[PDB]
Amino acid sequence: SMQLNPESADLRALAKHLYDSYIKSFPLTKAKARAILTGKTTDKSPFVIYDMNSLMMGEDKIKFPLQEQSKEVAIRIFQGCQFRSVEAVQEITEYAKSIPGFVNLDLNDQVTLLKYGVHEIIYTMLASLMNKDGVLISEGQGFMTREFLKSLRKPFGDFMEPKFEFAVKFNALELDDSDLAIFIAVIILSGDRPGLLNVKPIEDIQDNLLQALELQLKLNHPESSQLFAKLLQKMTDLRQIVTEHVQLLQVIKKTETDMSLHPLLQEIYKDL
Numbered sequence: 001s002m003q004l005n006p007e008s009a010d011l012r013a014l015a016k017h018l019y020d021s022y023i024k025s026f027p028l029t030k031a032k033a034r035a036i037l038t039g040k041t042t043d044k045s046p047f048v049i050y051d052m053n054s055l056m057m058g059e060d061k062i063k064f065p066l067q068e069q070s071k072e073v074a075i076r077i078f079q080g081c082q083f084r085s086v087e088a089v090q091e092i093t094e095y096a097k098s099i100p101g102f103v104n105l106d107l108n109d110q111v112t113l114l115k116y117g118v119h120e121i122i123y124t125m126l127a128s129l130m131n132k133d134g135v136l137i138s139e140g141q142g143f144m145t146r147e148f149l150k151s152l153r154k155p156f157g158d159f160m161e162p163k164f165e166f167a168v169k170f171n172a173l174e175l176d177d178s179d180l181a182i183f184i185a186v187i188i189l190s191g192d193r194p195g196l197l198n199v200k201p202i203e204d205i206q207d208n209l210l211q212a213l214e215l216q217l218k219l220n221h222p223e224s225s226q227l228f229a230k231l232l233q234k235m236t237d238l239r240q241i242v243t244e245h246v247q248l249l250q251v252i253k254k255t256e257t258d259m260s261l262h263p264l265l266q267e268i269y270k271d272l
């Protein structure tokens with residue numbers, strides 16, 4: 001069974017390092033998101049976008065567009081989501097640099113792990129900002145309803161729904177930021193990504209993160225012995241969400257020309 005030894009003290013040290021770096025890299029933590037979503041925050045309520053009227057009032061309220069603002073609502077929303085995804089790529093990149101051993105990997109491998117990892121991490125962390133009713137946007141200053149997003153014309157009405165479906169089930173696991181910091185690191189350090197140069201050093205880092213994660217979960221969740229196994233299952237699930245997402249982006253690229261795909265996202269999508 002579980003032991004207090006030097007190995008376990010090192011794994012707890014790693015968990016703390018990752019948590020501290022995760023806090024630094026991602027201002028809106030799950031703890032803060034949940035406080036807003038339950039109202040248990042003392043902060044001002046987010047502005048709620050639940051219909052076309054409150055979307056347009058929202059554009060006046062929420063600050064975070066030359067011929068962008070000429071496009072129909074669904075495209076303005078979709079383009080906004082793309083920009084926020086690119087900001088998320090930047091943050092997740094900075095987080096990865098804090099993962100011990102990551103910056104010592106060959107720079108091409110660092111880039112490959114991020115290329116194939118970032119969307120998995122985006123869907124994981126998006127769950128922190130979701131409840132069954134909607135999602136927090138612009139770092140908690142807004143809340144956009146799930147049914148409002150579904151109401152957008154085909155094919156835009158379907159692009160968030162699979163992320164909500166993932167989030168309701170993921171959120172039932174009741175992970176906290178301390179758990180997530182390690183989970184995200186595990187996903188990034190996946191040795192099976194296409195086109196990696198040096199698989200073994202990545203596998204060696206991931207093995208240590210997986211040990212850190214299993215110990216964190218045993219300590220932090222006395223009421224489930226299944227949680228580690230369930231989280232390995234979520235890692236495979238996320239690869240499905242991303243596949244499905246990419247196919248939707250194809251359908252959009254094919255059917256919905258006169259609508260710009262962010263060049264950086266194009267680069268990432270190339271070989272997913």
Ligand SMILES: C/C(=C\CC/C(C)=C/CC[C@]1(C)CCc2cc(O)cc(C)c2O1)CC/C=C(\C)C(=O)O
Pocket residue numbers: 026027028029078081082084085087088091121122123125126128129139159163249265
């Ligand atoms: C999934 C999505 C938007 C990502 C929105 C988003 C910001 C997700 C990441 C959530 C985290 C990582 C949570 C923590 C956090 C804290 C911050 O302080 C700031 C941000 C951005 C943040 O983002 C729309 C569909 C994808 C598109 C168009 C694409 O890809 O084609």
Ligand SMILES: C/C(=C\CC/C(C)=C/CC[C@]1(C)CCc2cc(O)cc(C)c2O1)CC/C=C(\C)C(=O)O
Pocket residue numbers: 055058059060062063064073076077078080081084129135136137138139140144160
């Ligand atoms: C659903 C989603 C982003 C909506 C992005 C959005 C506000 C789209 C609407 C864009 C338009 C129609 C265009 C101009 C504009 C500017 C604003 O400043 C505010 C709004 C509402 C706005 O609306 C992904 C999750 C985002 C997170 C966590 C975040 O961390 O964001």
